[PDB]
Amino acid sequence: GVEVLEVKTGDAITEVECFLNPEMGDPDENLRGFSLKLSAENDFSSDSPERKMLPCYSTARIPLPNMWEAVTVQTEVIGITSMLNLHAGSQKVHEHGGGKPIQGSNFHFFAVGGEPLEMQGVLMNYRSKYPDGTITPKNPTAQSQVMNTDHKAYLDKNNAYPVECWVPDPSRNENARYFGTFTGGENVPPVLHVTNTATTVLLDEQGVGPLCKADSLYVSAADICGLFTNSSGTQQWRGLARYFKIRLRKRSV
Amino acid sequence: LIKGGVEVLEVKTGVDAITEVECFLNPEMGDPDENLRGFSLKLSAENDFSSDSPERKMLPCYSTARIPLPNLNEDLTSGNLLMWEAVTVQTEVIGITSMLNLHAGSQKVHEHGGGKPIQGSNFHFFAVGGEPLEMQGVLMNYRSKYPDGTITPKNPTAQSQVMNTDHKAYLDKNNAYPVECWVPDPSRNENARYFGTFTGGENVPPVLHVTNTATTVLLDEQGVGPLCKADSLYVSAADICGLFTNSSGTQQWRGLARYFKIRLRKRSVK
Amino acid sequence: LIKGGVEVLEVKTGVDAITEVECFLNPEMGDPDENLRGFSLKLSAENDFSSDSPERKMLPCYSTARIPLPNLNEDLTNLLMWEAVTVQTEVIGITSMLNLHAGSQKVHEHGGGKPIQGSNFHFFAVGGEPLEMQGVLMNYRSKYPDGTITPKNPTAQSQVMNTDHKAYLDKNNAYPVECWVPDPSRNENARYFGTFTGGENVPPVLHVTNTATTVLLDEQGVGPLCKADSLYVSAADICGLFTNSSGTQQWRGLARYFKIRLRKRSVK
Amino acid sequence: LLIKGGVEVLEVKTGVDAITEVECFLNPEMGDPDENLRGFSLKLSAENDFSSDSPERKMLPCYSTARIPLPNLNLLMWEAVTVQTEVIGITSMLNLHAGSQKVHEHGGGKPIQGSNFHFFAVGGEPLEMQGVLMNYRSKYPDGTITPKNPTAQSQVMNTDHKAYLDKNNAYPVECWVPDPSRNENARYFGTFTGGENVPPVLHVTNTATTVLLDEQGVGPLCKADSLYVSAADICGLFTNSSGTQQWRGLARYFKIRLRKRSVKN
Amino acid sequence: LIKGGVEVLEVKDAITEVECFLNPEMGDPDENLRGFSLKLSAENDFSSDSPERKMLPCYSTARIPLPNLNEDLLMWEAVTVQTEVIGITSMLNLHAGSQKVHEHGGGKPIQGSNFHFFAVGGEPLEMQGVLMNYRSKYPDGTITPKNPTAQSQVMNTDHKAYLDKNNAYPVECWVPDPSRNENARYFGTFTGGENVPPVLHVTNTATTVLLDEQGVGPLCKADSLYVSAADICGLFTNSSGTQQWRGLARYFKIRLRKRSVK
């Protein structure tokens, strides 16, 4: 919300990094990174999901040295090879076979901003009764199933904003860059790439990156990798942490 | 250099020569009742081609909106006319994560499993133009009897199942032009840019990307964007995301809104 | 610099040195009756290779059209030919496959109809002369029906490459797609593009946009040169199989639009 | 200073007759189990124990190769600069009436689908291959050339298994790959896609050229005025009405442009 | 300009090339089944998950000695790599051992979850541990996250390791650490699912440049280059229905140049 002047040159650069843990629901102390098992077939009139079943967006505020302009990010999902454990817990694919890989709907999303991520609410079912401890669209209507401009939120709390209720708001986020891919379907294969050679440039069309208000950088993520199928046939979301390395420079304003 | 039936001259320059407009365009999937905004009526199947009378609320339609822009041409005898020229669009489908609700209404994938994701045939389409989108009609079945309140190819013939050049329409009404009957007309739309992808099949995964970093340039090969006739910008969309499968096995289309942010500049015309 | 049996000289410039033509080319899927334009006859299956006699209406064919261009060389006192420089093309009516209420087998009890899916072939060509084809057969012993033009005097080698099987795409609804491909050993005066995707459950994936242009110039900057002021467009757009409530399957095809920009080229 | 094909590379020669083009096709070598089934393999056996795996020759697709003689020529050598290549006859797979198992009652025949391999090379000498086996104990049939004295290490990398692709219809595709530790005087390209239900995806166009020049601008140099083309185009499996499966292959077209290159003797 | 704990000066007989074929480490359950794992167990409770060593694919690594430079400072700088997976066509053997797809049909292709990964560095690859199940009891001869907690199922920064031993670091326990590896370049793709088709490309025309944004490649400490790989191609399904991982070797050709350092 400021007039942007010249990049400062000469201690004018800094780098910050974070590993941001996923918030899949964490149904007990041993099942960190998983959701509660999924319910199915609730009538739209009686759809009361349990909090531990709902993955939420992750976010962290990173303090910076006492404006900082975010210029690049390196990011990837951490622990993708853990899905090669087919011996623990997963339903056998057939008699004498190995366990079923994690697969199905997934969502991979990150943002880097100079302020909290701005979100827009959209619901599958406006009549869903969301559980205490979630932050979901207030006073939803049938219009909330399409676009209801009342549903604006800041991603200002961890393990609170359910991924199923909120998307990054393309009508705001003037001071953030976000990227997400949703792939839906029962049998969707997880496809995840890692490399330390790929950098995303955060500069806009005028060469200006996110400007860090109150010397704070905000990282946001959601990395729902797919569904884990237990021997019983029950399914749980599995998520993984996301790494960020952000390069910043001093910008005169 | 002729476009939008005017002679195109130079881009106008100076501080106030740019404007930006935005809108969220709601999907028109059929909206069978107040609870199922964003969905179609459940899908029928196996109608003989000779007795195919789909209900209106089962038929997704193209969405469109006319966005009024400032008049630029007060000075009638200056000799200089200006029109708004659309230069870029940022667009994405809104609410894609809503499909991660597998607890409400969807058939379980197997005993003790979660609900079935939305999947299957999908169509993602948008246009930005200086006039209504120009459409060409093509039917699966020329003998389909389309319901009151839809606008569909008039007096279709067997040729309407392939290319019948009689079926020209303007996308000039919301919740009227069924997506299954109409496509953007590549023989027209000289003053609009359109983009669509159809992916057909029972098990097709929805794949949707969001980012505020991606801009589509709307300039043609001569560097001219859509020119806004009557100081109007037209946005058009269809975002059928796939089929929702209820516990009963019934299927309904699910659609989502589309966001547009369009940057325009002043263009001199004769 | 030789192309289209002429020595290629300079590109001409000026307002009259460019022209544009357009065509919607209808598909030729077999058209088994007057109501099923754009479909084939239902598919037979399991014919022994020794007794494989497909019906004509079951066989999609390549489409082609000859487009007259503005007449050149109407003075006897320097030769010009039209040179095709760009094409815009797309398949027309792709959203018609969102009709899941008419005719198609339900996906499951209480469900909607089965989408068109399965093997597909999307192909076009732009040339200064008819498309040159090479014959290749699944089964050299296939007995093709009257009204089709198929490889003559085939042998087992016709299942791989038999150089006898050369044809021009010189007749509509005649050259079955399953028998012929564009000939990579010829077509020195045409540009062709095709993608075959085979399989029972292949999803049709089709894109439309008026922003995409294909350049038709070769490595020497020469486009197809239009013999006798004629441009040839060719297509095949088999979108997949339509499955009827009975389980019978029929090909579905769609028309292809072409918009071709040409310029005048001096030749000797 | 610039060394390739065991010669010092000097300047490209230009002018009248300093360029030539060769165009050819390679027929596929899928096994050809009888006179009528050119382009197919014998039906596939299944479930042989690794200790008793003796595939029949007609069941094994092999690499195709040919030596193309060039116009006879400080020495001059032909330098391969570009190749245009594509698979010939891809639309033949739209015949779903002949021989293939119906997909369901009253349905059409099952498309060819499943594991496929599409490969070509252009070189100034035979393609250099490295052997790798699924099962080192496989007993390969007379008329095939397969890794000699294989060991369990032959299932991963056994550096003993070096061969030249020096005979057509002899080197089974399942036994051999292009050797990335050699082929300094060839360019090769291949894609393997494995799986029962893999869709064949094949593109044809006469507008796509592959440049064969390396990072120093030198193409394959044709030793003894010979150009070597190699291919394998296993398109997938054909499923007969009985459920038996056979590989189907198609020919590959090549158009190669060459120029004269000066080299030191 | 600091990398590999040296000040990087100018690029400088100044070039060398090394190559390696790095064998896969899939578990090798007997003398005949080199390149395969032991058959996969399934449905172990998270509280009683004790995988056998021969069932666990591990990362491969090799230290490649380079010409000695400072005998009387220069370091080798890795500039490019050519790499590919070796023996991909071996999966066209559908006659040996694999379950028939249906009566009278050929054998089932190798398919399912796969992981293709390589790295080139001037020092061992730096790894971060992440577990499906922190309570997994890993077998003797494996090196797995020490003192695991439920946080080990997400990100536990305690789990740092060097890829400093072959056939030891299970692929399922470790990933390249994006918070380290300042002196290496790594690339990997995981594709998960029962029916995933293996898709593998070979060509001698593809080179990966290993220079960073400042034009500096990995700098080879102690005149050593480290190559690392994992190439789990998918699952082989036996006639009985049992499944085994199949892996293949990876080839590397690396071009290096001399770099002045202080």
PDB file of N, CA and C in Angstrom, chain A residues 184-185, chain B residues 116-124 198-207 240-245 251 253, chain C residues 98 100 115 117 203:
ATOM      1  N   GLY A 184      -8.421 -34.000  -9.163  1.00  0.00           N
ATOM      2  CA  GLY A 184      -9.484 -34.742  -8.473  1.00  0.00           C
ATOM      3  C   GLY A 184      -9.705 -36.103  -9.085  1.00  0.00           C
ATOM      4  N   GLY A 185     -10.031 -37.093  -8.266  1.00  0.00           N
ATOM      5  CA  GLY A 185     -10.445 -38.398  -8.804  1.00  0.00           C
ATOM      6  C   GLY A 185      -9.984 -39.525  -7.918  1.00  0.00           C
TER       7      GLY A 185
ATOM      8  N   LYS B 116     -17.040 -40.426  -3.454  1.00  0.00           N
ATOM      9  CA  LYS B 116     -16.446 -40.398  -4.804  1.00  0.00           C
ATOM     10  C   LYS B 116     -16.202 -38.951  -5.202  1.00  0.00           C
ATOM     11  N   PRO B 117     -14.957 -38.611  -5.581  1.00  0.00           N
ATOM     12  CA  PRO B 117     -14.687 -37.306  -6.170  1.00  0.00           C
ATOM     13  C   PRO B 117     -15.535 -37.013  -7.401  1.00  0.00           C
ATOM     14  N   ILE B 118     -15.777 -35.733  -7.613  1.00  0.00           N
ATOM     15  CA  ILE B 118     -16.278 -35.234  -8.907  1.00  0.00           C
ATOM     16  C   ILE B 118     -15.243 -35.598  -9.969  1.00  0.00           C
ATOM     17  N   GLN B 119     -15.698 -36.160 -11.058  1.00  0.00           N
ATOM     18  CA  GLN B 119     -14.819 -36.579 -12.165  1.00  0.00           C
ATOM     19  C   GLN B 119     -15.683 -36.797 -13.395  1.00  0.00           C
ATOM     20  N   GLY B 120     -15.023 -37.020 -14.513  1.00  0.00           N
ATOM     21  CA  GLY B 120     -15.721 -37.259 -15.773  1.00  0.00           C
ATOM     22  C   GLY B 120     -15.595 -36.077 -16.704  1.00  0.00           C
ATOM     23  N   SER B 121     -16.412 -36.071 -17.728  1.00  0.00           N
ATOM     24  CA  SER B 121     -16.284 -35.105 -18.837  1.00  0.00           C
ATOM     25  C   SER B 121     -16.282 -33.701 -18.265  1.00  0.00           C
ATOM     26  N   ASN B 122     -15.417 -32.857 -18.803  1.00  0.00           N
ATOM     27  CA  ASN B 122     -15.376 -31.472 -18.334  1.00  0.00           C
ATOM     28  C   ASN B 122     -15.071 -30.560 -19.507  1.00  0.00           C
ATOM     29  N   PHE B 123     -15.420 -29.313 -19.323  1.00  0.00           N
ATOM     30  CA  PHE B 123     -15.216 -28.291 -20.352  1.00  0.00           C
ATOM     31  C   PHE B 123     -14.889 -27.001 -19.627  1.00  0.00           C
ATOM     32  N   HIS B 124     -13.760 -26.419 -19.973  1.00  0.00           N
ATOM     33  CA  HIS B 124     -13.269 -25.158 -19.381  1.00  0.00           C
ATOM     34  C   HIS B 124     -13.008 -24.192 -20.512  1.00  0.00           C
ATOM     35  N   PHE B 198     -11.959 -29.250 -23.944  1.00  0.00           N
ATOM     36  CA  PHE B 198     -12.914 -30.326 -23.658  1.00  0.00           C
ATOM     37  C   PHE B 198     -12.133 -31.592 -23.352  1.00  0.00           C
ATOM     38  N   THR B 199     -12.451 -32.238 -22.231  1.00  0.00           N
ATOM     39  CA  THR B 199     -11.858 -33.536 -21.869  1.00  0.00           C
ATOM     40  C   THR B 199     -13.003 -34.480 -21.563  1.00  0.00           C
ATOM     41  N   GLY B 200     -13.191 -35.502 -22.385  1.00  0.00           N
ATOM     42  CA  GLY B 200     -14.355 -36.393 -22.271  1.00  0.00           C
ATOM     43  C   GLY B 200     -13.974 -37.716 -21.659  1.00  0.00           C
ATOM     44  N   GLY B 201     -14.849 -38.289 -20.850  1.00  0.00           N
ATOM     45  CA  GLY B 201     -14.655 -39.669 -20.371  1.00  0.00           C
ATOM     46  C   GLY B 201     -15.178 -39.845 -18.982  1.00  0.00           C
ATOM     47  N   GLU B 202     -15.600 -41.057 -18.636  1.00  0.00           N
ATOM     48  CA  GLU B 202     -16.271 -41.305 -17.329  1.00  0.00           C
ATOM     49  C   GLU B 202     -15.330 -40.994 -16.169  1.00  0.00           C
ATOM     50  N   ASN B 203     -14.050 -41.289 -16.303  1.00  0.00           N
ATOM     51  CA  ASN B 203     -13.107 -41.298 -15.160  1.00  0.00           C
ATOM     52  C   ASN B 203     -12.101 -40.155 -15.258  1.00  0.00           C
ATOM     53  N   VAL B 204     -12.333 -39.209 -16.163  1.00  0.00           N
ATOM     54  CA  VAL B 204     -11.389 -38.076 -16.356  1.00  0.00           C
ATOM     55  C   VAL B 204     -11.224 -37.344 -15.030  1.00  0.00           C
ATOM     56  N   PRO B 205      -9.981 -37.139 -14.561  1.00  0.00           N
ATOM     57  CA  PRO B 205      -9.739 -36.303 -13.397  1.00  0.00           C
ATOM     58  C   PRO B 205      -9.843 -34.829 -13.732  1.00  0.00           C
ATOM     59  N   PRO B 206     -10.569 -34.035 -12.935  1.00  0.00           N
ATOM     60  CA  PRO B 206     -10.492 -32.590 -13.023  1.00  0.00           C
ATOM     61  C   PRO B 206      -9.062 -32.174 -12.657  1.00  0.00           C
ATOM     62  N   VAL B 207      -8.486 -31.294 -13.452  1.00  0.00           N
ATOM     63  CA  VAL B 207      -7.144 -30.732 -13.232  1.00  0.00           C
ATOM     64  C   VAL B 207      -7.277 -29.238 -13.421  1.00  0.00           C
ATOM     65  N   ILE B 240     -17.682 -26.515 -16.681  1.00  0.00           N
ATOM     66  CA  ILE B 240     -18.281 -27.786 -16.229  1.00  0.00           C
ATOM     67  C   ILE B 240     -17.120 -28.598 -15.689  1.00  0.00           C
ATOM     68  N   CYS B 241     -17.110 -28.875 -14.390  1.00  0.00           N
ATOM     69  CA  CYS B 241     -15.917 -29.469 -13.750  1.00  0.00           C
ATOM     70  C   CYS B 241     -15.942 -30.978 -13.814  1.00  0.00           C
ATOM     71  N   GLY B 242     -17.112 -31.573 -14.018  1.00  0.00           N
ATOM     72  CA  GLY B 242     -17.288 -33.021 -14.049  1.00  0.00           C
ATOM     73  C   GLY B 242     -18.632 -33.372 -13.440  1.00  0.00           C
ATOM     74  N   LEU B 243     -18.797 -34.647 -13.128  1.00  0.00           N
ATOM     75  CA  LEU B 243     -20.061 -35.170 -12.572  1.00  0.00           C
ATOM     76  C   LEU B 243     -19.862 -35.482 -11.099  1.00  0.00           C
ATOM     77  N   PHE B 244     -20.865 -35.070 -10.326  1.00  0.00           N
ATOM     78  CA  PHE B 244     -21.044 -35.445  -8.912  1.00  0.00           C
ATOM     79  C   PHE B 244     -21.922 -36.681  -8.888  1.00  0.00           C
ATOM     80  N   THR B 245     -21.457 -37.734  -8.209  1.00  0.00           N
ATOM     81  CA  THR B 245     -22.223 -38.989  -8.124  1.00  0.00           C
ATOM     82  C   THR B 245     -22.828 -39.092  -6.722  1.00  0.00           C
ATOM     83  N   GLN B 251     -26.206 -38.870 -11.183  1.00  0.00           N
ATOM     84  CA  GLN B 251     -25.091 -37.959 -11.489  1.00  0.00           C
ATOM     85  C   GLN B 251     -25.622 -36.581 -11.824  1.00  0.00           C
ATOM     86  N   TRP B 253     -24.052 -32.562 -13.112  1.00  0.00           N
ATOM     87  CA  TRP B 253     -22.904 -31.688 -13.407  1.00  0.00           C
ATOM     88  C   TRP B 253     -22.623 -30.786 -12.211  1.00  0.00           C
TER      89      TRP B 253
ATOM     90  N   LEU C  98     -21.074 -33.392 -24.626  1.00  0.00           N
ATOM     91  CA  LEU C  98     -21.694 -33.186 -23.286  1.00  0.00           C
ATOM     92  C   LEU C  98     -23.158 -33.596 -23.296  1.00  0.00           C
ATOM     93  N   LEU C 100     -25.147 -36.391 -22.745  1.00  0.00           N
ATOM     94  CA  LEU C 100     -25.072 -37.753 -22.182  1.00  0.00           C
ATOM     95  C   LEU C 100     -26.485 -38.297 -21.946  1.00  0.00           C
ATOM     96  N   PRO C 115     -19.833 -41.171 -21.891  1.00  0.00           N
ATOM     97  CA  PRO C 115     -19.154 -40.301 -22.849  1.00  0.00           C
ATOM     98  C   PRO C 115     -18.562 -41.073 -24.022  1.00  0.00           C
ATOM     99  N   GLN C 117     -15.563 -42.029 -26.091  1.00  0.00           N
ATOM    100  CA  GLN C 117     -14.158 -42.245 -25.675  1.00  0.00           C
ATOM    101  C   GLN C 117     -13.594 -43.378 -26.508  1.00  0.00           C
ATOM    102  N   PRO C 203      -9.564 -40.805 -23.189  1.00  0.00           N
ATOM    103  CA  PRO C 203     -10.402 -39.619 -23.182  1.00  0.00           C
ATOM    104  C   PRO C 203     -10.138 -38.739 -24.392  1.00  0.00           C
TER     105      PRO C 203
END
